[PDB]
Write a protein that binds this ligand. Sequence first.
Ligand code: L5Q
Ligand code: CA
Ligand code: CA
Ligand code: CA
Ligand code: CA
Ligand code: ZN
Length: 316
Amino acid sequence: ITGTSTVGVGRGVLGDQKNINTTYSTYYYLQDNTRGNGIFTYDAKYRTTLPGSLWADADNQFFASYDAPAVDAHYYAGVTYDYYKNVHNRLSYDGNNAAIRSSVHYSQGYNNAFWNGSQMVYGDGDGQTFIPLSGGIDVVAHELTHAVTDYTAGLIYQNESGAINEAISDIFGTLVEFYANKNPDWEIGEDVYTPGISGDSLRSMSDPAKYGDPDHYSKRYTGTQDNGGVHINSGIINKAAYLISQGGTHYGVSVVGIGRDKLGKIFYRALTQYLTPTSNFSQLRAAAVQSATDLYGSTSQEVASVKQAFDAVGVK
Ligand SMILES: Cc1cc(C(=O)NCC(F)(F)F)no1
Ligand SMILES: [Ca+2]
Ligand SMILES: [Ca+2]
Ligand SMILES: [Ca+2]
Ligand SMILES: [Ca+2]
Ligand SMILES: [Zn+2]
């Protein structure tokens, strides 16, 4: 909407207070004009029609329970925008400051979040498997990264290219979590998964097998569930990314870590310059090797570590 930029205050899903960029015109809207062509957050009102209604509030204070998922969707979309702009010089998901749209309160008891080709969508969870999923900064950044992938490599969401699509979202979701520097880790969704169980998450990048996902190409899922295992075989690539950043010895193969910033640079360049819609795991290795060569030189430690990491997970 047309109005004047304002700053509201509210509480997120985990009870933390934060300031949010809003727009005033009769009501205060969850419309952040300070980033690109805007960040816009919508109320789906427990239904499945999208996007729903642009979120309107009478007093620019967002402390109601019903407000909390909207506060976090809005705020963490902004953090993710900031990461891509400040770290990769990328302006929104299309590189041209496309408006970022999110809807919360999608359906009833909905234990997921997703990017629907046009916008981010967050369930509230059923209160047992999940609490409202926008409470996870890694979840929000995972979803917005699907938009980045759509506009760049375009990885088709099935089989190995789909597992790469998933891993790219987990990698940059995690790097956004570290960028914001609030309880960062290499696990996915820990802040919103199973409120009755401490210390678990949906997935682990540092040890995918902790939640049953493969950490070596020989253990890949080859059936048809989950679009050919896109949330399962992502563990193979997630483990390689973790090893590139942090190092380790895995199935007897040693990897010297080069840190998160260089991980991010290598995989951002691979995503935007070398990957294609049908890239498989072997082609991702080649793309990452070439990206590290572009950035650091053929004989660099960085290139050596990329090769060791893919060796360690059985990807040639
Ligand atoms: C099946 C299935 C979907 C997901 C998933 O990653 N959901 C998106 C997230 F951001 F909420 F985590 N994991 O298994
Ligand atoms: Ca209010
Ligand atoms: Ca965390
Ligand atoms: Ca995490
Ligand atoms: Ca839990
Ligand atoms: Zn995903």
